[PDB]
Ligand binder design. Structure first.
Ligand SMILES: CCc1cccc2c3c([nH]c12)[C@@](CC)(CC(=O)O)OCC3
Ligand SMILES: CCc1cccc2c3c([nH]c12)[C@@](CC)(CC(=O)O)OCC3
Ligand SMILES: CCc1cccc2c3c([nH]c12)[C@](CC)(CC(=O)O)OCC3
Ligand SMILES: CCc1cccc2c3c([nH]c12)[C@](CC)(CC(=O)O)OCC3
Length: 581
């Protein structure tokens, strides 16, 4: 286009344009205040309007990365606050943008955002545009790979909560359960999209395509191969652009894809009808989270073409990607009861069987039993989901999380206590989400969400690497991640952590904390116990943590809380060392 910025301005409209630009700037430089960003946004928008008037004007010819990057480099106190990004500003495009992306920050470690119901309603009423603008800023700078359009969607849910609850009788009780519900949903979108960006970064575009072929085929089993090809291609392009900070390009293609899917919903899925009767952002989001379609009656038998056919080696050798693509498509349609990564593991085994069999003297007799190689791949995760859900049903979320914190601290004791506690808690929430579902949905839910949690762990590991075992699981294979982490056991080389009694010391401040924040503190001690006594059994550790919980309960219920913690605390810390031998 003659002017790219004018094009995107005209298409998306001013409101979305300004939103997406705000988000973009908030993601790249997370430390600058909100009012500085507002000024950058306004300056870029004014330029787009000026360009939209006369597209042949000076500088309107420039690309989006040129104009956006130029703008980023004008920021006050750039070299001081972001030395790393200021190094990029000397470079030209496309080198500069690639430098910007390289030096983004997954753990900015900003202050936690408390929902302050009284004061936020006041700020909402006085200036809603500023208030909702601030929400975009605050979420974007804490989640640097969030997809712009999807954040704009969740901003409308946020606004809708504050219109409903601020005029109402009780401000907190209306708003708090809605805001925590919106948090959960926002965190899930973020986790999914970060996995897609992580898949590009670590494994490449081919990996994103294959994941997407598997998932879309499951969701849209009645869509023909060429239809799924079209959608995955466009979707992969959306992902690539949103992950590489091309937010205006991302919003446009994402909107076109939603439009396309809804134009052709009769040849894609019958579950899209309600999603397609919605406004722009609502529609895109609904499609992305649409339930799987019912299995077609006429799904083909696969043994003939993929196991029994006599010229598979020739067909495979002619074009591997097309042949395996076709296999993955067909096998994924008929298996909505498998996880995405299981399907990719099965495809990898299919490939491996043909690589082996087609080198042997009589290939067809070798590859005749190829589908039977899948049996042990299917039963391994089916057992672990049944085992863990049985455990979760028996003991509940808190004890299940503790079981996993012990499990993972033994695997990787070099990881920081906060990270181990975070990952064990997140992994435990998969039990509460998935084990309650119908049993045919348990496996996919579980493994699909474990992947999100493990990718979080892997991203944290890129920042602060501590363990070669984690690096191998994170970097070797996307499909093998969850099995790789499961296969890890206690490393027999790890030196048990130096005993500091201060680590296991509690005080009366714990008593006034919320129940979640109490658990976290106990769970942190649990991790530290494992670090000091790595060979202690899970039953020993559970028993000792029970003694910690009882101690905290009695002293928080005492007349003189601090005298109780001081007297009873050292006794418990000393005896607990002996109980963990
Ligand atoms: C005002 C409090 C609030 C309300 C609603 C949603 C959220 C989300 C968050 N806080 C919310 C956070 C931070 C911005 C939570 C986090 O990252 O821990 O990440 C987005 C969803
Ligand atoms: C149908 C199978 C298939 C086909 C083409 C490319 C890939 C890649 C993969 N599978 C492919 C994987 C998983 C997504 C393999 C892996 O990491 O184990 O990541 C690399 C590209
Ligand atoms: C166009 C709608 C859409 C269609 C089909 C699959 C997806 C997926 C997504 N959108 C999809 C998302 C969200 C779950 C990314 C996004 O937020 O845009 O991530 C992967 C799967
Ligand atoms: C190479 C990565 C790849 C992996 C798994 C399946 C597919 C499919 C494709 N690529 C795949 C294509 C092949 C035409 C789209 C494309 O890349 O042009 O269509 C859907 C099936």
């Amino acid at each position: 286009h003659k002017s790219e910025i004018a094009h995107r301005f005209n298409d998306l409209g001013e409101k979305h344009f300004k939103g997406l630009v705000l988000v973009a700037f908030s993601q790249y430089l997370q430390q600058c205040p909100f009012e500085d960003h507002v000024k950058l946004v306004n300056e870029v928008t004014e330029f787009a309007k000026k360009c939209a008037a006369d597209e042949s004007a000076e500088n309107c010819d420039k690309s989006l990365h040129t104009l956006f990057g130029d703008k980023l480099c004008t920021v006050a106190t750039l070299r001081a606050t972001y030395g790393e990004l200021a190094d990029c500003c000397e470079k030209q495009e496309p080198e500069r943008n690639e430098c910007f992306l390289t030096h983004k920050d997954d753990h900015p470690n900003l202050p936690k955002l408390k929902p302050e119901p009284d004061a936020q309603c006041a700020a909402f009423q006085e200036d809603p545009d500023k208030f909702l603008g601030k929400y975009l800023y605050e979420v974007a700078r804490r989640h640097p790979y969030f997809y712009g359009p999807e954040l704009l969607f969740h901003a409308e849910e946020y606004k809708a909560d504050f219109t409903e609850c601020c005029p109402a009788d009780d401000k907190l009780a209306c708003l708090i359960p809605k805001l925590d519900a919106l948090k959960e949903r926002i965190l899930l979108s973020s986790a999914k999209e970060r996995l897609k960006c992580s898949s590009f970064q670590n494994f490449g575009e081919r990996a994103v395509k294959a994941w997407s072929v598997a998932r879309l085929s499951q969701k849209f089993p009645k869509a023909d191969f060429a239809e799924v090809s079209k959608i995955v291609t466009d979707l992969t392009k959306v992902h690539k652009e949103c992950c590489h900070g091309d937010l205006l390009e991302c919003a446009d293609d994402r909107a076109d894809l939603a439009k396309y899917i809804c134009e052709h919903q009769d040849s894609i899925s019958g579950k899209l009808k309600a999603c397609c009767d919605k406004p722009l952002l609502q529609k895109s989001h609904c499609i992305a989270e649409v339930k799987e379609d019912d299995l077609p009656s006429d799904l083909p038998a696969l043994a003939a073409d993929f196991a029994e056919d006599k010229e598979i080696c020739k067909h495979y050798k002619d074009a591997k990607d097309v042949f395996l693509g076709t296999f993955l498509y067909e096998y994924s349609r008929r298996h909505p009861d498998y996880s995405v990564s299981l399907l990719l593991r099965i495809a990898k085994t299919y490939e491996a069987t043909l690589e082996k069999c087609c080198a042997e003297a009589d290939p067809p007799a070798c590859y005749r039993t190829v589908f039977d190689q899948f049996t042990p791949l299917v039963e391994e995760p089916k057992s672990l989901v049944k085992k863990n859900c049985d455990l979760f049903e028996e003991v509940g979320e808190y004890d299940f999380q503790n079981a996993l914190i012990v499990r993972y601290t033994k695997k990787a004791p070099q990881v920081s206590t906060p990270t181990l506690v975070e990952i064990g808690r997140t992994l435990g929430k998969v039990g509460s989400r998935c084990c309650k579902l119908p049993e045919s949905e348990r496996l996919p839910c579980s493994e699909n969400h474990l992947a999100l949690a493990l990718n979080r762990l892997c991203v944290l590991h890129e920042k602060t690497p501590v363990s070669e075992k984690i690096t191998k699981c994170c970097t070797d294979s996307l499909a093998e991640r969850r099995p790789c982490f499961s296969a890890l056991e206690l490393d027999e080389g790890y030196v048990p952590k130096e005993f500091k009694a201060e680590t296991f010391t509690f005080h009366a401040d714990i008593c006034t904390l919320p129940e979640d924040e109490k658990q976290i503190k106990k769970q942190s001690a649990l991790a530290e116990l494992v670090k000091h006594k790595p060979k202690a059994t899970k039953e020993q550790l559970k028993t000792v943590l029970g003694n910690f919980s009882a101690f905290v309960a009695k002293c928080c219920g005492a007349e003189d809380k601090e005298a109780c913690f001081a007297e009873e605390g050292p006794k418990l810390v000393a005896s607990s060392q002996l109980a963990l031998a």
